[PDB]
Structures are given as structure tokens and as C-alpha cells.
Design a protein around this ligand. Structure first.
Ligand SMILES: [Mn+2]
Ligand SMILES: [Mn+2]
Ligand SMILES: [Mn+2]
Ligand SMILES: [Mn+2]
Lengths: 467, 467, 467, 467
């Protein structure tokens, strides 16, 4: 079967007829504005450590340097025990690292009955799904690791003693949750991003190309959580080329690419009741007291609003809308809110994941062989056979190799799978995302008539027995 | 790769080393005692209809004949709208049946906001998961269909006018809930099973052979929900052969195969608090005055108890126990109760579903040809090229062929999937079962040294890109 | 101030000028047709018990005798714990009865977190508001009590073991819900009422006198939920006197008193969408082939319809209509449906409750003496003085005397209050009813020019400080 | 019966034994810290207008001067129509003012079907319950009034046109909700309060007196939403006297009056799950990284936390706690959260209310007379009488007089009642408050042994018929 080159591919959870698509919606941060890596994470990391120091934390935090090779996205911080957990779709622990000390085997079960956590218990466990969580994730490890090995800190099971005062991982987590939040919304993160854009944000003429062709088959809108001063800066840079969509054409403003522009969306509340629909005065970047209602002329820019409001202005309905973004949402209203958008989920980790999947075929093959052999020793055996062939050295070599394969993805494994088992993150992707790729940009390699036909997912009795 | 024949396979969700199994636990009903189909469904069906009529439902209910080709296990009854729903792992409706009229396409949105249900509502939706639910599934369809088309009944959104009386589907469903309950627990269902065991229950000497071999390598126990009177009749019939485990050998009683036997288990409550541990007078079948607990001397038959008590009585830890059964439980206590068994789930539908996967390969292969060709019509295309090639006709042949395939399994399709999407049921199997096969009997084809290595389950970007 | 005798009074929640009333609407059942007590309760009680037994409840249910001294109208059945709850306007438990054992003091907290229920849960709690609910109230108590104390039944938190069967209170309640429904709508309850009208229904010539006088000053209509067959029997019995309105005058048919008559009203649905407006063939009692709508010529008897259609047929606006009845509705459409009637609510308990307020004044006055004295023991005291005067004994005499008072109204006390706190029922009366009396008949003592001026309802700082 | 002087009285909704009280909890803002009136409201008003001007609103807003005689607490802003509504306990409109134009009579019904609003519809209606709402309330009127009469503004039904731009009352309301919030939490409101304390906050040596006696019979805690820098300033001023509790005694720090001090409570979330329990470093007023757990020694000061945490540290249970405050809470968790505090609700408006109730007895009397007379004209009348005595001039004089009585409380009537009918605010008081007074300070006139015995609330048939 013909398939495009792996790195251009859009992958398909649920089938989707692109001719049917009338409106393309865009997330900005980490979707059109891909922040550069590991620079941007380093930036967030350092400002968060500097905020933690300024509010009391010890100076050794300034020795911390963000390491992009530790965190995998989607881990669970357990504020009871201070652990970064990699669980599966149902709650089973696949990885448990205390600080940087990976708890391997039976001693996990000591803390976690049945190697199992009830991931609905959000008072105890915080999911770290988003791309911005990456620094917070490495940081939580650094903090747990440092205090655990710092002689002036007595480690107990839920935190650390220091004389009369006790700092629990729950208190420690909230300080980190505050700092992070403070950095995003009151620190210099936006500011220092906007003043060295070439170091932090990607630029690529494929962005104005693809959006322009999208605008010839349908409408294009932007629904971003950032304000207008931030969005104007970021979007001006992404469209700063000495031409427009194609070489030779005049450059045009980034606004000219969107039928509707909405900032201050307040997602996910955006997707329910919303906030009052407001309008931004594009000169001050402040909200106008008035708001222009009616037709959909260009030059207007909205703040607040609702999915319904955006859908009414565009004159669409949910299934006419392909929402393109890096965030995974719930369906807490899908059973009442009659309107339901399609989804394209951006998953940047896929780029390096696909490199491992190809550039490391020797480990996938050699696992295939150790399983061939295994399935051969037991060939002529049934329950009558009482032979116990030694397979320890084999069972050893499968661990060492699937661990090697794991570590190709970094110290916390693949985003989508630990060893054989799938992650909780993979399931949310399969639940939420009709389409997904490493960047939406890969839509450029598909015609807008394209029929995306879902990939079959097989249960064991389907993947391992022939027709 | 070498694989055992499809109909002897045990399938592996999570990997398992059998050499580490020190106890084999058995469900009785629909595990060891496979009731014959469609006879046993019919017998429950007719007694339930007969119980309903004896409380006032019209005499036309007696014209019903149970029909095995309609129900698929695991469907959801909507008590609001009187519909049988086949949903996916996340709540997406795959199939809506009001009685026998299948709601196809857009008028499902009319009743279900995004073709979606919030299946966490155990006041509106009822899962029909179990093999005993099959009659009650088909009954619900018949009842809603009859009152819909009976001229003397006015049909409403949420029920029927029965003259001056309003019969809500929810009130009608609880009537069917109580009748099934009453028939199983107080009617003639058990008695009419015992007095014609050959008509209702499967027999096979493979059962004592296997259980004899399990007792060579580990302890063996029976934890059933039935009473000892019924359990003696059933287990004695199943072991009525003019020889013991092998041919030529002396027959031994069915008790002799179990180091522990437990009736009145009251699962799932069994698996948490439980009930008081009782001891059955094997003679009367009534409970003893006390309970001689202590040594594991076979001859004692317990009533009630808890998972905890079995493990103590057998002197074993959870991970030593492989619990063999046909019921899917939830991990509601997995995060606290330090003891957690391994599981083998018996899924009988697998036999005839494996038949369709093999004797209907004309359809799988043709759908694949329609997918090779589809991919070929778009080989040289991109967002640049604006050809709109007509695919509607071939896009019609894919519907008819996936409908034909879905219909190879009955009117509600495969247990595990609808066309391409996986069923809620498939995912509950995935969460619960370490191993699964059409019958537990299939263990007989594997050495008890076997390493069951799990099947890789691929995401779209895994199944669709090469190494 | 001059007031009419207590037993002739009409009480005023919201003020009303009768001279502005242009239509008088009548509920039939338990308004115009006051069923005799305890005979009619008994007759429904015995048929419901007899319906339950015919579907499998034990024969001891036939030993039950309906007992008028137990139930108070407006109680809440908890389907979880099988309790009859008397709560206040905000959800505070005043009284908890498991069967006939009254839960007093601290073990109510054991079942109810703050002696409180979230009465918005129409899946767990059921309000028993209506005069037809009285039998079903007492029945629920008997049933829970019998299975609690019957030796062959094991009692659980949420139900009973009926041998191998679990009978939940919720499942037991819906059985009683359907039986009452069936008895009213399909059993012999109506027929056994018609064939001994003198035993079951009150008669009084004050009824035609009043309705004759209303027709002098305004239009008059009947909007009942019963059918015309039943309505003819009932209304003809009520008007069977050997004279018309006054003595000496010629009798006239019961129809002659109504400008419009409406059966099969299907209230409350009547009050919104409604049903199609139908016309009854007065001869057969079956529906005509069509409906001759138009002029208001008396002789036409309608079926179905809506509040809207009555107003159109009478050519009147809501505020012209005074709806006389015994049922309390909710303001679920009051904020949109521009049409809203005035209301007179019939509360029969008021007769004997007015008796206790007058013939038990020995108790009210003594409680007041205990309050004068209590206030006297603390006259010269403040946060300065630290005397702790012993009041426990007098604080005991206040309990026994408020219990004695509460018991002057039956085992569940007054309809409107428990000791000092007001009942949920009292506040629903307050929300719904403009006027209220023990019977609508009491209008007869007021001129149709009367200005009903509302009673001031004082807050503590109003009732307890002088001008 | 003996009663203390009206202005010293504590009023009693539900009975409460003060000997039973172990812990006294305190709200700060508007409870211990009574802000002076109308100065403090003026202050908030002006800063909010200045914030509205700075973000775009027209300069004429600076002409606004806060008028304390317009707002009554507890009104409903309807963002659809821009109306301040005074409704009753169930949704019935008692007052409707558009800006300063009081809609009186039938034209209300044009906008409000049945003079009724569904007050649960919080997307449309905002309740203005709190003391801080007073300026926002007057302001909403000023804004609606100004734009309505400003020639350059075209008034429509849901807002105002100004050429191409439309400003809806919903957009207008959110700007006011923002400004207000901004003033409280980022403007100079706290700041300018703290720098002229003698103009804004009341001081009274009865505060340290009463708290000291409370500390001799039980524990005292503070649970305030303000931070520690604000709380220290405010509390130091309230206890700035040249003595301690009594004349002649040494002054002691305000902290010495509390066993537990909690700031940053985040009520009402405080009363559910809470926030992490933190500790404040009393020198910086910033949060310590550590937190001291264990005994309850003085010198420690908490931030965040939970009702449960405060209750555990104090070693109490809900009914041991009398929570003293000016805010009215819901019981959204009262049906699950096992712990439930008693309540003392501070209602400052009561001071002036009680002056009207006494200093204006001539209007209450003259209404009593017009009702005596009314009840006399209709004395010798029944339904036989067809006399229509003219009572228009009387019915006129009752309106003019109950309007005069109303206006003694200000332009929007009493806090607790409009004319005869009670307000929605009065009902929440009766639901939430076990005790209430104009200031908690009145506890000083009651012994701590005092039994507060609820005031009887009477239904019409109880207040108007004798024993
Ligand atoms: Mn984003
Ligand atoms: Mn079973
Ligand atoms: Mn009625
Ligand atoms: Mn306050």
C-alpha cells in the first residue's frame, strides 16, 4: 500500500472526509507557534527556579540546569509520596521514579498496593499532560532529589523535616504550581520570549503557504488563550518573510489569513458557557467598551466568547470544524452540548519517536527474534509435557533490550508506551484526536479532498491469528 | 512464527509466566459449567416472559421466541429512550436499536447530542455485560418493539400509554430486571436445569484431565456464587464419566479435584469485605452449626467468606493466584487492597468470532483492496493539487462490506468491535483480563511452564509505518 | 379585630381582590369530591396490598390494616435507607422513621451527615405530597417494618435478603409505586367507589349553593384529571339532592353549573404543552370523531387540551382565573409562560389541626410559661456574670410538652410544622397558594367583593420587638 | 416576657444552647472590622469609577457620587434587561428599577412574564448579597441611568447602540464585575483604607472585652480571606487602646486573643476541599516554605487550609463551633460533609431597621387601623351579600402608607421585606443563620450559659386565629 514519507504523514484514529471540512480552527501556543527546544523549556525552568528562590527556596536550586532527556510528557506527580509515575490506561504503574531514583520491582508495591493508583483522585495525583508541563516535571524531580540527598534535610515518607518545620510534597507541589503559574502570567516569560524571538519560536514559510490554501477551500479562525499584545507579536514573527504565501508574492499581514481571530479564549471554559463576547481595539490591545455584532468582516478581533459564538459567527456546525491544537480536552459536556468539533492533535514528540522507530530497527528486530525462538522451545509442548527449559538468560535479554529500546526515547520512555504496554497518554490521544501528527504542517502533503481512513487497532486475538 | 491452532489459543493482554502460578481458582457457572446455546438462553427467556405475564404483562409476550442472532453481549440499555446502545470505549454510539428498528445516521443525533452518552450515569444507562444478560437483552428489544407497534398502545419518547396508565421504559426495564432476578433466584430455572442436565450443560472429559494436571503443579479451588445443592448437581454431572482423569483410570468424586471449595461466594462483595466464613454440611446441604477452620484437609466445603480468607486458607499471595472465570470486574479496590489476583477470562463468543475471522477472509481482503486503491487515487496529490476524484461509489462499497462483515456476527455485530471502532466491551476485557480464550479448557494445550508473552497493540503511527 | 369563625376562614398568603375574579376553576378529586376518611384511604390501601400479593409479596401483607394516625402528608421516602423523612423548608431532618421505629437523636447523623438531605435528588428521595399518597405512605412504613422484624428476612442497610434474593428498598418502593398506579388506573378502585358512593364520598348542599353563586358573578369551569364516565358518576352523586341550589328550587344537572367542563386534563402537562383538545361524546362517554370548537355554548364536554386553550375558550386572562384545588404545583414555566392563574389550595387537615390549635391551648400556654420563666432566670445576666443556672429539668419539660403537642396531630405530627420548625410542606404551600382553607366550600362565607389581605409573616426581630 | 433592649438583642432562628459552645470563629472584614458608612462605600465606588474611566468609560462617570440611600442589599441584576430587581423567596418581582426609573405595575409584566424570574439562571441574573456589593449596586443603576438619558446613546432592550458598536448590559456588567474585583485585589482599596484607618474602620473597646470573656469559656479562632499584611494592620488598629480587655489592664497584642489565626482562607472553597495548609512567617508576612504541624501553640499563623483542618487543630467538631460572620453561605455540601458549624450572621442594616420599627410606629399603627376598618365593612357579609362598598380610597391609603413605610428604609425598601412580602434575602438569612444581630458585639449582653430559644414563625392560619 502507498504511504507518504513517514515524517509527512497525518495519522488517523477515526475516519474523516476532508472534502466535508468547512472551517479550520487554530490553537496558537505550541501549534502555529512552536517554541524551540530545549531553549524554551530551559527559559521556563530558570524563571521558575528564580521565583522559587525569591520566595524562600534554598540557593542550590540555581545550580539546576534543565535536562530535556529526563521528562516524558504525561506523567503523574503523586503529592503523597513525591513520585513521578508513568501509568497505563487504567492505573497500573509502569515507571516510578523518586527524584532521580527509579523504583524498580517489589519496593514499588510497598508504596503502591498492586502497583496501582486510582488516577481519578485528583486531590492526590496531578497529571502533567501539556508541553508547558515539561519544565515543571523535571523540576519536581530535581526538588525531590535534592532535598532527599541534602544532609540538612531529614527525609520522611510524605516530605522533609527541617527542625520544627515540615515540608510535604503536597506543599512543595503547590509552590511549584504557583511559581510556574506566576511565571506564565506575571513573570517575564512572555516578555523575554518576545525580545529574542529567533531563539525561542520556530519560523517556516510552510505556515503561510498551508493556511493560504486552507483559506481557498473553507474558513480559517484562531482561538488562542493568549492576549492580543502577545498574539500580535508572535503572529507577526511567524509571518515575517519577504513574501506572502508563495515566493514572489507580496507579503500580507497575518490577520489577513483568518476570517475570525479570537484571543482570551479561556479554553476549556471556552467550550462550555464561555465568557462575554468582547472585542479588542487593535491599536491599544485593550478591550473596546463596545462590541461589533453582525457580519464577519475582516479587521475585527474578539476576546472571550464561546465555541457556540465562534460557531455562529462562522455560520458552521461542530462537524464542519476541524480544531487544530496541541491540547487534549475532556468530553465532560459531549453528552449534552449538541455541537462537537473534529480534532487534529499536534504531538511534537512524534518526530523523534519516528526516528527511533526507523533508525533503531535493530532492537525491534532482535526482540522479534527472541520471541520467535521462545515460541519454538514451547512448540511441541502441551500440558502433558512437564519440561521446564531454562529461559532465564532469554528472559534477561528481553528486559535489557526492551529497556534499551525504552531509553532511546529518554529517561522516562516513550510518550505512548512503556515496554509492551500503552500509556495513559496514548489512550487520551486515541479518545480525543481524530487526526494527529508531529505538526499540523503535514496537512500540506494531503489534498483537501483526501479521505483519511482510520487505522485498525487490533486485540491480541486479532493481531496474532491469520486469515 | 509458530502459533498453536487458532481454536486452541490462549490470548495474552498482559504477559504471564505460568511457572509462577501456585493456585488455580475457578468460577463455576459459564466457566466450568458451560450452558448450551440457544437452549439455556431460551429456558431463561421463557421463564422470564412467563414471570412477567403472571404479574400482568399482555398474553402476546407468550408468542415470543428467544432468538440467538439478535443480541450481542455488552450492550447498554437506555432507560430514558428505551434503546439498546452499542457504544465504544469512550461513549461513542456505534449502534442504536429501538426495539428492532435500527436508528441509522442523523436521527441518532436527534436523541443523542453528539452520538454520545455519559455512560457514568447508572440511573439512566444499564450495561448488559454477562452471559446471563443475553436473554434479558433480547427481551428488552421485544418488549419495546411490541408496545411500539401494538395498536392499543400509544408510544411516547419515554414509554407507552397502557390505557390510562403510563408505562415508562425505565419502569418497564426494572420489571424485566426483577423478573430475571426472580427467575434465577426463586423460580424454576435451576430445577429445570438439573432435571435435564444433558439438554442444558456441556460435558467433556477434557475438564477432569486439565484439572487433574493443574493439581499436579499447584493448589486448586472453586469459588462459586451458587449454593451447594446446585453446585453438587452441576459438578457431579460435569464429572459423570465412567473413568477418572484419563481413560482406564478410576473415577473419583468432583470434590477430590479441589483443595478448597467455596459456595455462596456473593461476588463481587466477596472481593472486598465479603461475608462471614461459613461451613456447609455436605449431607443436608444446609449450613453447619459452626465452622471447623484450620488445616486445609480436603472434605470441608465453605460458604461465604472473602478473597482474603481464601488466600489465608491456601497460604498464598494474590500474584500466586490465577482466577479463571467469565465475569469482568472493576478495579474499585485495586488502589488500597494489597491483594490482587491474576485473571483468565472465558469469552465463549470467541469460537464463532474466530470462525468469521477465518471463513470470511473474502471480506477482510476485499476491504483491504478498497484501501490499496483509495490510497492509489491520492498517491500524487497534496494540498497543492485540487482534483476532487469521485470516491462516493467505492466509499459505498466499503460501507456495504463493513456492514456485511458486522452482520456475520449477528444483528448487533461483533462482541469486540463495530466495523473499525472497538467496543466498550473490548476495552473492559483489556482492563480486566490478563489471559483470555473461548474456554478455560484451552490451557490444556500449553505447558505449565509456559511464558505467555503479551501482544503488542499498535497505535496508528505504529501499525502504518515500517522499520 | 373582627374575624370570621376559625372553621369558616379562608387564609391569605398573598393578598387578593375577589371582585377582580372573572373565572372559577375547579379540581374534582379531593376538591369538589372530598373522599371520606379513613374509609377511602383504607379502600386504596387494601387494593394496593392485594395487588402486591397477586405479584408475590408474602401473605402477611393481608393482615395489615390501614391506620390513619400514622402518616402525615408531605413526607419524604428515602429509597436508599428505606426511611420516611419529615424535613424542613431547607432539607433539615425533623423526623426519621424506619418502619415504625423512630430514629431519635444521634443515630440519625449516623445515616444522615448533618441531619440533612439534598432533596433535589429525585432518584433517591420521593416526596409523598398528595392526599392519594396517604395510603402509600403508611404502606411503605408497614412493608419496611415487617421485613425488618420478620425472622425469615435478613435486614441490610439498603434492603433485605429474601432467601437468595436481595430486595432493595428502592426496588421495593417502585413496586409500591406501580401498585398504587395500577390500582388507581386499572384496578377496581374507581368501580368500588361508584358502587358505594355514600360510603366513600362526602355530600353537602353547600356545594351547589356556592357554585350557583359563583356563576352569578363570573364564569365557572371544571378541569379534572379523571375520565367522563367517572366524572359523571361522581358529579351526579355530589349534586343528587331533591332540589337545586336552594331548598324548594328545582334540581338541575351538574353540567348546568359549568360554562366549560374538561376531563382527561393530564395535569400538570395540562399547564404547559398539554394534549390535543378533544370533545367527549356525552352519550357513550367515548371521544367524538372530531371537536366542534368555537362558541362557549354549554353542553360541550372537552377532553385533554391545555391551560392556554381553557383561557381562549373562556375569553379570559390568567389573573382573571382563580384555580381551586388540592394539588401543589411548581413554578417551572412561570418565568416564560406569560399566563399564570391565581390559586386557592384545599388543605383538609386544616380542620382537625385548627381543632388542636384551639382545644389544646393548655399546652401552647404552658410552653409559653416555660419561656417566660426561662427568660426570667436570665434577666440580670450578661457575658460578665458567670452563673450557670440549672435549666435541664425545665429544658426537659419543654421537650415532653412539644412532643405531646406534636403527637396531638398523629405520629408524624402536624402537616405544617414539627415543634417550632416549619415543614417543607408548609413552604410549598407558601410558594404555591394565594388562598388556602380546609375546604373550598369556605368561600361561601365571604362576599365576592371581598378583599383578602395577606397575613404579615414576621421574622424573629419583628415578632419579638415592640413598636 | 422579659427582653433585653432592642439594640442589644441577639435574634434566634433556630434554638442554640450557649453552654454547648466550645469554639468561637470569626470573620474579619465587616464582622470584627466594621467599615464605616457611607465613607467606605464611597471609597470603593470612586476607585471603581476611576478604573472604569481608565479602561474606556466616558468621563461623566466622575460626576457620580455614591448615594447610600439608593441600594438595598441583596438585589438581583438582570444582565438581559439591565434591571435591579427585588424578588421574594421564590422569584416574584417586588421591585424593578431601570437605572433610577422604578417600573411600577403592568409594564413590568411586559418584560417579566408573571412578574416572575427563575433566579437559578445565574448566566442571566447576579445576586448582590454582600456588603461590598453595595457600591457595585448603586453603580449599576448610575450606569444604566446615564447611558439611557445620554443623547449620544441609543437605548435598546438589551443595551445601547453607539454607531457600529453595541454595549449590552451583560458586557456592561462584566466590566463592572472586573473593575470591582480589580479594585479589591490590585487597586489601592486596601492601601488607602490602611492609611486613614480612623475614617474607614470602627474602633470600640467592647471588641477586646467580649473576645476576652469568650476566651475564658472556650477557644477563639479567626478565618479571614484577607492576607496577613492586611489582617495585622486591621487587627492592630481594632485593638489599639491604652489598655487591654478592661480599663487599667495592660494592653496585649491582638494575636493573643486567638488560639488559631488563619488568613487566606479562600472561603467558601475553605469549607470544602480547601487549599494546602500553609504557615505565614509573621515577620515578612510571606509564606514559610515549611509548616509547623502538631500542637496548638500561640505565635503560629496559618494560610490556606480547610474547615476540617481548623476543626482538627482546635480539637472540635462542627456543632462545637459557632461561626460568626457577615457572609451567607450555601449548603451545597451539607448533605455529605459530616461536619457542620453553627452560625451567627452579622446584619448591620438591622440597626436602622429597628429604628424604623420603633421610631416610625405611627405608620404601623395606622396600617393596623385601616385593616381594622376594612375587616369591619365586610363583617356582616357572606356570599349572599351582593354589596360592593367602595374601598378604593382606603385601598389607595394603604398603598401610600406602606410605600411611606417602605421608603423609611431607603429607595429600595427594607432588607428583609417589601410591603407585606418577605425578600429572597430574608429567606437565606432564615436558612443560614442560627443566630443573627446587627453586630456580634451584642453577645456581650448574654451569659455564656444562655439558652437562645427560636422565634416562632407563623403561617396565616396560625398568626390570625386565637387559642
Ligand atoms: Mn496551545
Ligand atoms: Mn460465572
Ligand atoms: Mn385533585
Ligand atoms: Mn466578611
Amino acid at each position: 500500500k502507498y504511504r507518504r514519507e513517514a515524517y509527512h504523514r497525518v495519522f488517523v484514529n477515526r475516519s474523516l472526509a476532508m472534502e466535508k471540512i468547512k472551517c479550520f480552527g487554530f490553537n496558537m501556543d505550541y501549534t502555529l507557534a512552536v517554541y524551540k527546544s530545549p531553549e524554551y523549556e530551559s527559559l521556563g525552568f530558570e524563571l521558575t527556579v528564580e521565583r522559587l528562590v525569591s520566595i524562600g527556596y534554598p540557593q542550590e536550586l540555581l545550580s539546576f540546569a534543565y535536562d530535556s532527556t529526563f521528562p516524558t510528557r504525561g506523567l503523574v506527580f503523586d503529592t503523597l509520596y513525591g513520585n513521578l509515575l508513568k501509568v497505563d490506561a487504567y492505573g497500573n504503574l509502569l515507571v516510578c521514579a523518586h527524584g532521580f531514583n527509579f523504583i524498580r520491582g517489589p519496593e514499588t508495591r510497598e508504596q503502591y498496593p498492586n502497583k496501582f493508583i486510582q488516577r481519578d483522585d485528583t486531590e492526590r495525583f496531578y497529571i502533567l499532560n501539556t508541553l508547558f508541563n515539561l519544565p515543571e516535571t523535571y523540576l519536581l524531580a530535581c526538588l525531590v532529589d535534592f532535598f532527599t540527598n541534602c544532609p540538612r534535610y531529614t527525609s520522611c515518607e510524605t516530605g522533609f523535616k527541617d527542625g520544627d518545620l515540615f515540608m510535604s510534597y503536597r506543599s512543595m507541589f503547590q509552590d511549584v504550581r504557583d511559581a510556574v503559574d506566576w511565571v506564565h502570567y506575571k513573570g517575564s516569560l512572555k516578555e523575554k520570549t518576545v525580545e529574542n524571538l529567533e531563539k525561542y519560536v520556530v519560523k517556516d514559510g510552510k505556515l503561510p503557504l498551508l493556511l493560504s490554501r486552507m483559506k481557498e477551500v473553507g474558513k480559517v479562525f484562531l482561538a488562542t488563550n493568549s492576549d492580543y499584545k502577545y498574539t500580535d507579536k508572535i503572529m507577526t514573527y511567524l509571518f515575517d518573510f519577504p513574501h506572502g504565501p508563495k515566493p514572489g508574492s507580496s507579503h500580507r499581514p497575518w490577520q489577513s489569513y483568518f476570517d475570525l481571530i479570537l484571543v482570551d479564549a479561556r479554553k476549556p471554559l471556552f467550550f462550555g458557557e464561555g465568557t462575554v463576547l468582547r472585542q479588542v481595539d487593535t491599536k491599544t490591545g485593550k478591550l473596546k467598551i463596545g462590541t461589533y455584532t453582525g457580519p464577519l468582516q475582516h479587521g475585527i478581533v474578539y476576546s472571550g466568547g464561546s465555541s457556540d459564538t465562534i460557531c455562529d459567527l462562522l455560520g458552521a456546525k461542530g462537524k464542519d470544524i476541524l480544531y487544530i491544537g496541541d491540547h487534549i480536552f475532556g468530553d465532560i459536556l459531549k453528552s449534552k452540548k449538541r455541537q462537537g468539533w473534529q480534532t487534529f492533535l499536534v504531538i511534537p514528540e512524534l518526530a523523534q519517536e519516528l526516528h527511533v522507530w526507523t533508525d533503531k530497527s535493530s532492537l525491534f528486530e532482535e526482540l522479534q527474534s527472541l520471541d520467535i525462538f521462545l515460541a519454538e522451545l514451547y512448540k511441541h509442548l502441551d500440558s502433558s509435557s512437564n519440561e521446564r527449559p531454562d529461559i532465564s538468560s532469554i528472559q534477561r535479554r528481553i528486559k535489557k533490550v526492551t529497556h534499551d529500546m525504552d531509553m532511546c526515547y529518554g529517561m522516562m520512555g516513550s510518550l505512548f508506551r512503556s515496554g509492551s504496554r500503552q500509556t495513559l497518554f496514548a489512550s487520551q490521544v486515541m479518545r480525543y484526536a481524530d487526526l494527529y501528527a508531529a505538526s499540523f504542517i503535514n496537512l500540506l502533503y494531503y489534498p483537501f479532498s483526501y479521505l483519511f481512513r482510520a487505522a485498525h487497532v487490533l486485540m491480541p486475538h486479532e493481531s496474532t491469528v491469520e486469515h
